[PDB]
Nucleic acid binder design. Structure first.
Ligand SMILES: [Mg+2]
Ligand SMILES: [Mg+2]
Ligand SMILES: [Mg+2]
Ligand SMILES: [Mg+2]
Ligand SMILES: [Mg+2]
Lengths: 137, 171, 72, 197, 234, 191
RNA sequence: UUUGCUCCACACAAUAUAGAUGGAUACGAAUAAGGCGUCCUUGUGGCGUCGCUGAACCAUAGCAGGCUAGCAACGGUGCACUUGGCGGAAAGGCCUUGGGUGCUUGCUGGCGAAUUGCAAUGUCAUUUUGCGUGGGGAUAAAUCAUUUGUAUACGACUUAGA
RNA sequence: GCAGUCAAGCGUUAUAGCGACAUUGCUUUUUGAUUCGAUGUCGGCUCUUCCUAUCAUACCGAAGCAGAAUUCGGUAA
RNA sequence: AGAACUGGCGAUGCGGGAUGAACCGAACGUAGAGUUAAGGUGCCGGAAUACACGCUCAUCAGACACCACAAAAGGUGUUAGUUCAUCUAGACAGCCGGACGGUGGCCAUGGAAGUCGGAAUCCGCUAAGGAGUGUGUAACAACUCACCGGCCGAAUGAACUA
RNA sequence: GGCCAGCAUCAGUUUUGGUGGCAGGAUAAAUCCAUAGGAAUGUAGCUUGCCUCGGUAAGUAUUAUAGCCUGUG
C-alpha cells in the first residue's frame, strides 16, 4: 500500500463524438452529437436520427451527457448517422436513469383524471403490502 | 442586427454619346437592403467621383454561404476611422459562415476597440485553406489533434425562488 | 484605522449646467482656432495577412493592365 | 408553498438574498432566516470593513443617541440591508417587515424544521471562481460583536445532535427502500409502472 | 505590462551577426581547397595565450575556430551536401569546442607535435584532483601555504565576503586580515571536483593539472579518406 | 489570452507517497509526513504513474497560471523536505558584549533565549516552531543549526531569530552585532 | 368593595382581521466536488450507483364523508390513559412501553342521497378575563397620611411605625 | 516675466508652422561685508467640535548617522 | 465683447430626467377600452436577477455632466492591435568556459598598471575580447560586462496604438 | 316592475393562440446522390528502433479495415 493515490474527478468532456441533449430551442429534448469544436463556447452538432439539423450551437444550450461514441472529426451528416447507428447510441441512452426520469415525467404529465384515480387505488394497495412487510422485519 | 451579405452593382446614369457606363460591384455586409444600398453609395462616393443623384443601382442580390455547416478559419482585414488616419487591423475568426464571422468582428470591435458599425470598414474576409497559415494563438489552440476539454463549475438555472437541496456544480 | 471623508458623487445641478456652458464655449473656440490656424495637412497590407502575395500580384497585374487600358 | 419558509443564510450573498426576501415579504410570505453569521459579501475583507467604518463615521453631531444606530450583529447587518429595500416608514412596509425573523445560529424551534436555499443568491452559483469574499461573522467580530464563540459552541452542539438524528433516519430509509424493492415484482407494481409510478 | 526589464549597457563593442558566420564558412570552404590535411582538434577549456602560442607554432598553416554547427555545415553535414568526397565522416567527428587545422605537413610531424605539447593549467570541474590542498590554520595568505608565509603576502580583505559566501569557507576579519579558526581542507587527491572547489583552487593560483590538445581525425585532400587518430583520448 | 489547458509535472521519487484529495496534499517519506491545504487555489491534480503527478488549470489566465507554478514549487519543496530535510546554519557575532544563546523550557514550550545583546539586560525569547530542531555547532564558534522537514517553518524560525536582535538607534556601519543566516542547505549528504 | 381569586372536567353559549382551506417534509461539509449502497487489511481505501431539480415524497375514494353484511391479514391510523428516555439558544418539543377504545378504501356486497330547482365563499379548522353545573386548592399587598436624612426645587429617593 | 538656445514628439514632400523635458541673459557679484500711500471693518473674554496640510509625544526609513545631538522623509489627529 | 437671423420661456398644466426657469417627450373638455413616446424592467417601483459576444477588481471602482483637473504625463495591472528586428549553418533565460598580445600605451602623481584626472584611442591574433562597463586595491591582484564559445532546445525581443 | 347577477346568439373596438393555400430568391444556399481530382490535425497496410506477453515514439502509404476538402452534374 505504498503507492500514491490522487482523486480523479471525472468530467464530461467537450470532444468529437460526445452525445449532447438539447435543452432549449427548436430541438429541445433531442440527442445530437458533437462533430467539431469551434471555440470554448460554441460547437457544431448533428442530430440526424432525431431530426436535429446540422448546426453551430452554443454550449449554454445543451447538456453534455455521459455517452460518447467513435466519430471522425468534421464527419458529414450521413456518416454521423451511420456511426451513430453502429454505436447504438439510442439504446444506451434509453437504458439510463436520466432517460427514464424524462419518460416518467412525460407519462405522469400525460395521465388523465380516471388514471390518477387508478394510480391512487394502486398506491394504497402497494402501501398496505409494504407496511405489512415492514412490520415483520 | 444579424448580418447578411449582398452584392450591389451600380453605374452612372447614361448620358448623350456615353451609353454603357462601367458597372461597379461591391460586397456589403448589412442587416437589410436599404442599409446595404446606403453603404454602397457611401463607398462609391468615397472612392470614385460618383454621386447617388447621378447614378443608379443596377442590381442587388443576397449571397449565401456555400458550405454553412463547415467550420472554417477566417482572416479579417479591417480599418477604422481615426484622427491619425486609416489604421489597418488583421484578426482571425473561427466560424461556419462569413456573416457569423463578421457579426463576431463587429461585436468584438464594440467590446475592445469601442468602435461602431459606421466607423468600421471591412476590407477583406478570406477563408484560410491551410491550417499552417493560422497565426493567432487564440485560434491555433483549437486546432490541436483530438482536442478534449471539460467545463468545470456548471451553474444550473433555477425555475423556483427556493430550492430544497444544496446545488452541485459537478459536470 | 481612522476612515476619512469620501467625496460625494451625487450630481449637482449647478455644476452640470455650468459644464454644459463650458463645453459649448470650448467647442466654439476650437472651431474658431481650426478655421484660423496655419498648419500643413495608406497603411497598405498588414504584415500578418496570409494572402499578401496574392494581393500584391493582383495589384501589379491591375497596374500592367491599366497602363495599356488608357493608351489603347 | 409553505406557510413559513426557513432560509439557511450560509453561503448566500447579502444583497441578492435581501432583495429576494424583501420582495417575498411584500408579496405576503412569512420568512425565517437562520445562520446569519455564515452569510457572504462579495469583495475582500478589508474593503467590507472599510465600508462598515464609513457607516460608523455617520452620527448626529449634537446628540449621538439620535443618530444612525450601528448594530454590530450579523442578523442586524442583514436586517439593515433588507430594511433599505423595504419602504419601512409606511404601514404596508412595517407589516411586510413583521413577516420576517432573522437569527444567528439555529435556535429552537427551527432546528427540527426544514431549511431551504435561494439559488439566485448563492455564492458558489453567482461569484466567478477566484473572486474574494467576506464572511459576516468575522466582519461583525472585527466591528464589535461579542458572541461569535457562544454561537459557534451552540452550533457545534446542534450539529452533533442533528448528525445522530440523520444516522437514525438514514437507517430507516435503508429499511423502507429495501422492503419497497421486494414489492416491485408484483402485478400492482407493474401497473403502477405502466401508469408512471 | 509586468515583464522583466532588460539591462542597458553603454559599451564600445556590438554583437556579431550572420555575416561573420558566413565569413568563417567561406574561409573554411576555401581552406579545404588550399591545404591538403584537415585535422579535427578538441580544445575545451583552453586559454587564449595557449591558443595563440599554438597558432604561432603552426605558422604557415590555418587554425579556424567558430560554431560547431557552422563548421559542420561548411564541411558538409550529409553525403549529398559535402564539399569534398568522404568529408562528412570528418564533419560528424567534430564535437565540443572544435578547431580545424588546415596544413601541408607530414602526418607523423603533426602527430608528434600534438603528442609532445603539454602545458600546466587550472583544474576544471568534473576532473580528477591533481593534489590535496588545505588552507593552513591562522591568517590566510595569498597562496595559502604553497609558498612560505614570510615570502607570501596576506589575502586582501575585499575577498572575505567572496570566501565566506561563494566558497562557503568559515572566515573572520581580524585587524583587516582574513583568518580561519581551523585548517580547511579544500580537496583530496583523486576526487571529482565541483565548481566551488575549482573556484577555490583558481583563487589560490594552484595549477597542477595538465592541458593537452585532443586530436580526433584528419582528412587527406587527394586520398579522400579519413583516418582516426585517437590522440590523448584516455 | 484564456489558454485552454496549462499543466505542470511533479516528480515523485521512490521513497515518497503522495495522497491528494480535495486539494489537501499529504506527503509521506523516510523522514516523516507533511500536510498542505491548497483550497485557496483552483487546480486539478491527476496521477499519471507512481512517479509522476500532473497539476493543471483549465481555461485560465495569467494570474491563474502563476498560481499553478507556485503550487508545483510548493509540492516539490514538501517532497524535498521529507526526503532530504532542510538545514539553516546561523552565526552570531559581536564586538564587545558576548551574546549568550541557550535553549530554555517555559512549561515545555522550547524557547531560544538570547542574552547580553549589546549589553542589554532584556532577555529575548524566540519560540521554536513545531517540527524544528535547534542544535549548537560542535567545534564551530557561535553557530546555531535549525533543522526540519518544513522549509517554511525552518526559514521563518531563522528569520524570527535574526529579527529579534535588530540594532536600534545606532549606526550599522559601525555596530555589527547580530545573528545572521550563514548557510541554507539540506540535512542528508549521502553524496 | 352584598363570596372576592385561580386553575380540572361535563352541559349551553359566543369567538377565530396585514389575511387557514391536504403536510413548514430537520445531517453536516465541499462545489477544480459530493450523496447513497456494498466490501476490506477502516483509509485522503476498492467497487457499484445517483444528479442534469420539489414536474418530488408522503397523503389523497366513502351524507364536508351516513347506516349495515362479509373476506383476507396481525398491519395502518385517531383518542383518552399509562412506561421509560432525551431536549435550556427563545428547552415548551422529540422519541418510547403496555393495554383499552373507534375507523380502516387491502378485497367483495346491500341500503341512503334528489326540490340549494343552471352558479352565487354558500359558512365546516385552535383558543375562550362570559355565564350556569360542580368535585379539589390559597387566605395578600401597594399608595396617601405620619416619619428619617445617607436624599431633595417639586415630584422622586432612602428610612421607621399595629 | 520677457528675449533666446536645444529637441522627444506634432506636422509634411513645400528642412514652413507648433512644441514637453533641459538651458542661457536681465533681475543679482564674487572673499561670508554691511521702514515709501493696504480707502474700509478689527480685536478681546467664555466655551465646543472638526481637518491634517504633524510642532511635540509613538513607531519606522535615509544621511560621514562613532557616541551625544541634529537634518530630511514615511505611517499617524 | 460687438452685430444679424432663427427657436424656447414669461401667460403653460401633463409623462420622464430622484429633486429643479430654460434638458428629453408631449401641449390640456368629461369618461371607457386599446397602443405608445421619452425613460426604464435586482428591491424600494409598474416592467426579463432575459438571451448573446467581449472588457474591468479600484486600502472608499463605476453606473456624470463628453468641459476642466490632463502634462495622450506616470504604472513590473490586464486585453487586443501595428511596425520592426533575432532564430535548428540554434530564439530568449540560465550555468559553465574564454575574455588575449605590443602594454604598466603618453602626460601627470607620493602613489595612479582599463577603472582620481587631461588628451590620443592604434596595431596584432582572433570565435571574440573597449588603450575598458562597474565592484575593488595605497598601487597591483581578484571579480565583473561589452563580446565569443559549450550545454540546453522553439519561439523571443524592442518601440508604438487602442 | 325595482335591485344584483349567469348563459347563449350578434354588432363595434381590440388583445392572444392553432391550422391551411400560395409567390419569390443561385426557381434559396445546404443535406443527399453520382463523378473527377486533392491534401492532412494522415485511415488501413508496410519498414525500423527497442519498448508490460504489442501498446507505443518516426518514415512511407492517399481509402485501403476511418474519413475529410474542392470542382462538375
Ligand atoms: Mg357510498
Ligand atoms: Mg499625512
Ligand atoms: Mg415590480
Ligand atoms: Mg483640484
Ligand atoms: Mg366580437
Amino acid at each position: 500500500s505504498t503507492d500514491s493515490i490522487v482523486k480523479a474527478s471525472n468530467w464530461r468532456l467537450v470532444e468529437v463524438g460526445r452525445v449532447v441533449l438539447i435543452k432549449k430551442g427548436q430541438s429541445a429534448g433531442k440527442l445530437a452529437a458533437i462533430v467539431e469544436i469551434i471555440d470554448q463556447k460554441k460547437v457544431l452538432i448533428d442530430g440526424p436520427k432525431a431530426g436535429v439539423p446540422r448546426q453551430a450551437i452554443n454550449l449554454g444550450q445543451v447538456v453534455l451527457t455521459p455517452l460518447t461514441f467513435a466519430l471522425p472529426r468534421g464527419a458529414r451528416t450521413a456518416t454521423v448517422s451511420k456511426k451513430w447507428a453502429a454505436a447504438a447510441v439510442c439504446e444506451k441512452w434509453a437504458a439510463s436513469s436520466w432517460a427514464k426520469k424524462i419518460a416518467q415525467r412525460e407519462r405522469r404529465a400525460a395521465l388523465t383524471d380516471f388514471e390518477r384515480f387508478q394510480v391512487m387505488v394502486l398506491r394504497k394497495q402497494k402501501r398496505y403490502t409494504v407496511k405489512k412487510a415492514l412490520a415483520k422485519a | 442586427a444579424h448580418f447578411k451579405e449582398y452584392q450591389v452593382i451600380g453605374r452612372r446614369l447614361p448620358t448623350e454619346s456615353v451609353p454603357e457606363p462601367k458597372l461597379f460591384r461591391m460586397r456589403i455586409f448589412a442587416s437589410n437592403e436599404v442599409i446595404a444600398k446606403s453603404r454602397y453609395w457611401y463607398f462609391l462616393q468615397k472612392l470614385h467621383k460618383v454621386k447617388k443623384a447621378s447614378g443608379e443601382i443596377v442590381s442587388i442580390n443576397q449571397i449565401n454561404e456555400a458550405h454553412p455547416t463547415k467550420v472554417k478559419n477566417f482572416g479579417v482585414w479591417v480599418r477604422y476611422d481615426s484622427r491619425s488616419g486609416t489604421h489597418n487591423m488583421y484578426k482571425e475568426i473561427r466560424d461556419v459562415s462569413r456573416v457569423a464571422a463578421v457579426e463576431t468582428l463587429y461585436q468584438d470591435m464594440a467590446a475592445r476597440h469601442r468602435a461602431r458599425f459606421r466607423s468600421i470598414h471591412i476590407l477583406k474576409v478570406a477563408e484560410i485553406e491551410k491550417t499552417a497559415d493560422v497565426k493567432r494563438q487564440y485560434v491555433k489552440q483549437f486546432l490541436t489533434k483530438d482536442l478534449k476539454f471539460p467545463l468545470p463549475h456548471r451553474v444550473q438555472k433555477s425555475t423556483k425562488t427556493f430550492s430544497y437541496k444544496r446545488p452541485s456544480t459537478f459536470y | 484605522m481612522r476612515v476619512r471623508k469620501r467625496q460625494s458623487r451625487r450630481t449637482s445641478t449647478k455644476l452640470k449646467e455650468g459644464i454644459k456652458k463650458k463645453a459649448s464655449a470650448h467647442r466654439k473656440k476650437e472651431k474658431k482656432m481650426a478655421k484660423k490656424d496655419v498648419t500643413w495637412r495608406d497603411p497598405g497590407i498588414p504584415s500578418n495577412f496570409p494572402y499578401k502575395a496574392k494581393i500584391l500580384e493582383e495589384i501589379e497585374a491591375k497596374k500592367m493592365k491599366d497602363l495599356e487600358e488608357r493608351e489603347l | 408553498v409553505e406557510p413559513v419558509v426557513v432560509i439557511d443564510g450560509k453561503g448566500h450573498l447579502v444583497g441578492r438574498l435581501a432583495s429576494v426576501v424583501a420582495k417575498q415579504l411584500l408579496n405576503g410570505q412569512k420568512i425565517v432566516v437562520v445562520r446569519a453569521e455564515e452569510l457572504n459579501i462579495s469583495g475582500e475583507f478589508f474593503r467590507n470593513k472599510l465600508k462598515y467604518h464609513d457607516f460608523l463615521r455617520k452620527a448626529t453631531a449634537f446628540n449621538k443617541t439620535r443618530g444612525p444606530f450601528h448594530f454590530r450583529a450579523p442578523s442586524r447587518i442583514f436586517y439593515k440591508a433588507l430594511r433599505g429595500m423595504v419602504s419601512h416608514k409606511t404601514a404596508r412596509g412595517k407589516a411586510a417587515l413583521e413577516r420576517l425573523k432573522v437569527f444567528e445560529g439555529i435556535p429552537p424551534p427551527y432546528d427540527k424544521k426544514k431549511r431551504v436555499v435561494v439559488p439566485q443568491a448563492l455564492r458558489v452559483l453567482r461569484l466567478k471562481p477566484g473572486r474574494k469574499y467576506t464572511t459576516l461573522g468575522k466582519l461583525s467580530t472585527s466591528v464589535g460583536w461579542k458572541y461569535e464563540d457562544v454561537v459557534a459552541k451552540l452550533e457545534a452542539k446542534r450539529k452533533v445532535s442533528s448528525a445522530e438524528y440523520y444516522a437514525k433516519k438514514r437507517a430507516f430509509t435503508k429499511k423502507v427502500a429495501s422492503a419497497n424493492a421486494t414489492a416491485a415484482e408484483s402485478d400492482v407494481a407493474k401497473q403502477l409502472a405502466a401508469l408512471g409510478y | 505590462r509586468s515583464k522583466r526589464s532588460k539591462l542597458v549597457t553603454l559599451a564600445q563593442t556590438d554583437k556579431k551577426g550572420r555575416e561573420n558566420k558566413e565569413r568563417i564558412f567561406d574561409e573554411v570552404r576555401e581552406a579545404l581547397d588550399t591545404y591538403r590535411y584537415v585535422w579535427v582538434l578538441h580544445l575545451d577549456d583552453v586559454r587564449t595565450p595557449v591558443l595563440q602560442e599554438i597558432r604561432t607554432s603552426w605558422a604557415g598553416s590555418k587554425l579556424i575556430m567558430g560554431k560547431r554547427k557552422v563548421l559542420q555545415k561548411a564541411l558538409g553535414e550529409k553525403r549529398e551536401e559535402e564539399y569534398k568526397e568522404n568529408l562528412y565522416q570528418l564533419s560528424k567527428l567534430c564535437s565540443g569546442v572544435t578547431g580545424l587545422l588546415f596544413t601541408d605537413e607530414d602526418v607523423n610531424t603533426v602527430k608528434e607535435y600534438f603528442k609532445s605539447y603539454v602545458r600546466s593549467d587550472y583544474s576544471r570541474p568534473n576532473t580528477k584532483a591533481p593534489l590535496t590542498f588545505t588552507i593552513p590554520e591562522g591568517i590566510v595568505y595569498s597562496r595559502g601555504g604553497q609558498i612560505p608565509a614570510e615570502e607570501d603576502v596576506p589575502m586582501i580583505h575585499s575577498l572575505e565576503p567572496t570566501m565566506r559566501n561563494k566558497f562557503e569557507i568559515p572566515t573572520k576579519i581580524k585587524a583587516g586580515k582574513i583568518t580561519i579558526d581551523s585548517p580547511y581542507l579544500v580537496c583530496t587527491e583523486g576526487e571529482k571536483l565541483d565548481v566551488r572547489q575549482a573556484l577555490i583552487l583558481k583563487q589560490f593560483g594552484i595549477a597542477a593539472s595538465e592541458f593537452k590538445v585532443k586530436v580526433s581525425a584528419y582528412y587527406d585532400n587527394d586520398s579522400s579518406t579519413v583516418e582516426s587518430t585517437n590522440i590523448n583520448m584516455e | 489570452m484564456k489558454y485552454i489547458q496549462t499543466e505542470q509535472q511533479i516528480e515523485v521519487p521512490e521513497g515518497v507517497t503522495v495522497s491528494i484529495k480535495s486539494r489537501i496534499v499529504k506527503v509521506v517519506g523516510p523522514r516523516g509526513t507533511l500536510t498542505k491545504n491548497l483550497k485557496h487555489i483552483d487546480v486539478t491534480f491527476t496521477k499519471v504513474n507512481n512517479q509522476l503527478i500532473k497539476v493543471a488549470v483549465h481555461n485560465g489566465g495569467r494570474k491563474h497560471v502563476a498560481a499553478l507554478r507556485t503550487v508545483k514549487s510548493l509540492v516539490d519543496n514538501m517532497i524535498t523536505g521529507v526526503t532530504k530535510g532542510y538545514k539553516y546554519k546561523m552565526r552570531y557575532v559581536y564586538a564587545h558584549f558576548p551574546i549568550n544563546v541557550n535553549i530554555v523550557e517555559k512549561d515545555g514550550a522550547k524557547f531560544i533565549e538570547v542574552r547580553n545583546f549589546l549589553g542589554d539586560k532584556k532577555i529575548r525569547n524566540v519560540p521554536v516552531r513545531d517540527g524544528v530542531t535547534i542544535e549548537f555547532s560542535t567545534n564551530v564558534k557561535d553557530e546555531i543549526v535549525l533543522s526540519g522537514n518544513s522549509v517554511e517553518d525552518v526559514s521563518q524560525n531563522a528569520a524570527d531569530l535574526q529579527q529579534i536582535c535588530r540594532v536600534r538607534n545606532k549606526d550599522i556601519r559601525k555596530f555589527l552585532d547580530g545573528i545572521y543566516v550563514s548557510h541554507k542547505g539540506f540535512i542528508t549528504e549521502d553524496l
